[model samples]
Target: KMAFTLADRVTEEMLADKAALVVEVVEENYHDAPIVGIAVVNEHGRFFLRPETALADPQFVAWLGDETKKKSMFDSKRAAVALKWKGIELCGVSFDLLLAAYLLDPAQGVDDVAAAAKMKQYEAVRPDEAVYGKGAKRAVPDEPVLAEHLVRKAAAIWELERPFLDELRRNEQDRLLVELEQPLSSILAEMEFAGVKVDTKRLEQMGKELAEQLGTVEQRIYELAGQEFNINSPKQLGVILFEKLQLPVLKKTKTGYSTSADVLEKLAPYHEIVENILHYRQLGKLQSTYIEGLLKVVRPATKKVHTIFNQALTQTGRLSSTEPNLQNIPIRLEEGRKIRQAFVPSESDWLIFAADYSQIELRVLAHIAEDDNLMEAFRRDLDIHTKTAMDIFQVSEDEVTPNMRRQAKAVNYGIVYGISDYGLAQNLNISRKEAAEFIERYFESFPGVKRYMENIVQEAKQKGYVTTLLHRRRYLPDITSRNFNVRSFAERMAMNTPIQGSAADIIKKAMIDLNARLKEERLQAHLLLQVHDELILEAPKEEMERLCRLVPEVMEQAVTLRVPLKVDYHYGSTWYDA
Candidate 1:
């Protein structure tokens, strides 16, 4: 691995002669270095751009967009998030390093090297576990569709339920009418029309740079280690970065004081080691598994990948992908959202809009288990997640920090299946002891989930079946099986089936009802796709005025529970906008 050097910002003409440059906007996660700096690199000289460079100089930023082939050596959206946040727009991205990594290996796709530049706990791609009752089933908003009626909301809910009536009441016959699987299957084909026009050139460029970036990145990592300094405290390197930078001491380590990352992370405020070692491991994982291993899993495409089918779908009542495996891609990460750049709408001037059920899985927990705290969270028009962060942390909503919300969100996610301390620990990088205590405090705050944990699981053991709000059934004969493992699996599903299954039932009903009204309302919008909790649609810019009102109404009314289902929507030229 070879490397580069940092500089104070210099002449534009000298920098311009430096060949095809990968100019990146820097983010302020300063730990490895004291500077939050940008690096515009050519094949030879790496010109580290200075932090003091002003966006205030509109001409300087204007020069940025117009000149040279500037790429995101890795993360463009962080570049997106930062510059836009810096009160400037930074868009003349001629090539994208992210998608290039995608071309190098499309299967491993979006997971790339820079996740390590900041976070030490990033995934190679993604993962799953700690499911079931003990495991904590998350839900189908984790998955998407059940298209049926363009008709009425509750009446169609009755229509959907009516089909079931024939078999027993023959009154629930509409149950079969909204038979969600087929309708959803067909609607998905039209989603197939979006053809997902990928930014092929970008991915190709991305694949090219990931190779170059890693060598210099690895060099930077080792340099940070071999060249550590800062004389301080007459103690170890611990105080060197800690007290030297006036970092708050959070905890002492088992080996001695101040080596464990858990303690160091808490100490990293305005203050700021193997820090690079751990970061290297983060990249190595991204590089080894995601970038390199993607080479093994498969390859890329300059042409579009039509995400047309599913194996028909559900365990938690979620859908699954069989082939090109489009459904499981990421959204929360700006990195994850890059995959959708190719997922453009099929028609011209028709923008894609996304509207998802806000916290439906969590809301499902409220209605089914009848938990007041959970129900109350949904009742008020507050952001349920930050509120969970608020309620759990005992802090005001406005004051909740990212880490506070981060920890609380994990506890909230694992609520249904009763996420074990060990499971929660892996997510937050805390010890099992801290994780266990957090769960203890978590339940005390919302004993409602605790009661549901017992009530819902036992309800399954006795009734031997789970029923959703949509009037559907899922049986778990194994809950009674003598073998411990067999019973364990069944018990977890029984606990979460309704939460997951109902989201499906609810989402499908909304889609079906939306379909009838969509045609009835006679608008130009087409339901382009069902992204688990939300339905994604494409519409003429003109029709958005009508649609903005209709979609949320249909979605929220699809099913009635004590907590009102909320719909959150966003619009962009692409699905990634949300």
Candidate 2:
């Protein structure tokens, strides 16, 4: 049994007065921190408590037994915590210390509780490293030392809450935090907890097939080279290509020649060996990263892979996945696309439904740029690339060729990314002069877009930052830098950040809205994954029609814009079909 003493001055009656409860969990797994204990403090008294044990409160007594019901108890209107994912399951999380500090300044790199406290100039607590040591030297300290550290962290959260809340309010981001980000943390945590089921047998079979394909490609590459070397080694590949095969060396790194993907693509036409090498590398990455890498993370008992989403990481407000990043699975390549086949529904009768925004970034751009021609194309539901080609090339719709549409599509994407003539030239494999001419023609065709770009850079120069539709800010400290490349990058970021960040904000809001609707409607569908512009869900076949209609409606109406947002959806037995 655990022993504790009550303070002489404070009674149990005093403990009920504005009691600030702060709970934290330390677990073996960093992704899932199960509660080890809880610390409670108030104006009158302080105490330490643990879960799965007798407590004075009846509600908490019921909460202590079942972990599933504990998440429902969190009253976000009341208290603050360091990491919401850790504490959200226990009680309603009002303020997230890490997220607050991150939103204040993303580049400051508030990585831990100590760093977050330090950022606000609060040093009441010791650094985590000092308390727990580092690397191999790490271990839990004595109970008193650990408990005090936890208490200090809890107190810091209380002290810093008002300042961070005030900062968010002053910057007009309090709503963004409360409405969008705070709720998103719990949603993402649930998504991670309810991970996508993987077909282990199918995955293993695919792995074997990839290995065989890789072996074939490697053998072919060696035969083409007339010598076998480490094809995986860039240095060895570089030597074999540049020196032995006498291929043109387009670029070089500090150590050796650059046999990178772009370089290999450039040399592919010159030699058969380059083609084989590219194929080898492609299959190698798929085999290692997706096949074997994924297999390593799949839980043996559940046959599921849980990927943690970093909500506060990206400057543009995009969520990033780690512990086997689900985002980077290639869609263009058929070989890479096969990986999705392994992601199956938890139930046999259920199907995977995928819905994604169509040209969301361009739609966002049209609204932001206020380009009449661009907005009109989206309004009329025209093929934007074809419309762009017709406008820039001064051709009729029927006259717009496949090549012209492809070039126009590139230009459209280039505009969103702040691509330069040189960058566009590399992408389209054209002369820099031709690329510049294409950009000039593109601007001439859509003068408002050009105006928007010019105006945004000027605005960034004046204000030192750019903000999204939701007032999510990203500072451009290098906007006025003396260095041309640095200043140019900052200028591009100023132009692109709002469009991209706003798109991110829309999807995030959609997830929150969709999640709420599902609960309200009591649908059996569960949101399984989010990849860029797409949302994947699994539901019984009976709910297909309802979801097909509701999913798109929710996504389209998530935010209001000048042009209407569009969503395309399809469902299949497997993720691949969707």
Candidate 3:
């Protein structure tokens, strides 16, 4: 470790003349801990101070917050949250090593400072897990041990910044670094700090209603089985279903049986009890995961739950919510969609407003693919799935049956994800031969898309990577693989990456622009949640009418494409209504 002079205090002499310094705040736990201390490193030397000592000093505090001043760090999102909690809006994050490494690869493992250091082969940074243990044994190690570790990290950020910036500039992504993501990170921090207001009473009441429904289903299942055991224990339930009731076992498991959804779903034809069990388990999971989870993470005073968005996680640059995964809350199932009812506005007369891009990926696909038929399908006012059905089945719009539209909708879903004939067949419950024809006919109807799809796959293979509209890069090493399974993963990502990633990029741009417009317009409304395509916000009831116009106004123009994007809004006392 480089020897560092201990800061007696953040005096004017120590603070002078460093225009851009590397700052890394030491937190008790990396996930969500409050900042304990601050490490500021500059060309002259490194100095450490209590975050309180550093924050209490007017000169040093103002220096860090100055918009013109520059600061470099690893994971400025973490730094933003840590510092923002202390009443400082961290600005001039000219470099974030975490984002640099992520933009370079977007792979899961190489996002941290130590990992970036190793990837660049600098060998100066220590792996966090090794330095501070992990899991149950995880802890903040004693001082100088922790201080030196942070110093090493700051040094790594300092050393790695120039080379990474050179690479980003060489790759023509420096603007994306300077322009969008850094500004977006602080915007994300603002939305995060102002979190979502959760209605735990509503959630608990919903849980009670579900439990009563579950009780009736439980009785029916027990009567059919002729005996009841611990239904929560899959082993006991498996024994009852397969052995006692003599239902056929479609799938095998470790304990000589299994009752997984797929396995139990097949058994529905054999007995009514199987259906009841599926319903029972669905209610049970809804109760435990979402309802219970909502109540768990909510702050006592505010009742707001702040879900951290993992910006570096997705291949498509999509943000993922953790701290109980509010993103994956059950929207597909009715019982689960009911959970949205509990997410209400924080203020007394404020409302929760939601705005999501309508068929954004498909719209992105139409723009990027530039298919006349596909673009024309969107240009008119008909439902896209209905139009797809009309074109594919060669039926009139009135003759495009509901079932036909469902199949076409599945087909649309299929193409975007690069689904196989087998998978398509399974989804639509059609023969593989028919599924293949559906795809062939889809391409024939939209031939420009057909060529674009195949061409991009070939081009991405040749180039060894695919890029978003904003030029965020994701490399596809397996695109050239001999294994069909492995290569198809790359091939599918190749086709969909630009569409998905660009959609992700546009929404992020919208958030940044949205924040600016909100302040400029002098509205009280603010963004509360961003779950993929939608931005959930809370505003005074008086502001709703203007926001309904303003949100879509911002989002639709977030990025221009061949087909103009559309946004639909919903607002309510809870998140459930418009």
| Top candidate (lDDT) | 3
Model 1, global lDDT:
0.55
User: What TM-score would every model get versus the actual structure?
Assistant: 0.56, 0.91, 0.94
Q: Model 3, poorest ten-residue lDDT window?
A: 22-31
User: Candidate order by lDDT, highest to lowest?
Assistant: 3, 2, 1
Of the two candidates 1 and 3, the one with more favorable TM-score, higher being better, is 3
lDDT of 3 by residue, 264-339 (tens): 8777788888888888888888988888767888887888887788777888789888885777877787777889
Q: Candidate 1: where is the Cα deviation over 4 Å?
A: 1-179, 214-303, 385-402, 431-434, 481-486
The best candidate in terms of TM-score: 3
**Residues 258-333, model 1: lDDT tens digits:** 6454555554443314455344444444445433433332324424444434312244445544334455554554
- CA displacement after TM-score superposition, residue 36 of candidate 2 (Å): 4.1
* Candidates in order: C-alpha RMSD to true structure: 23.0, 4.2, 2.4
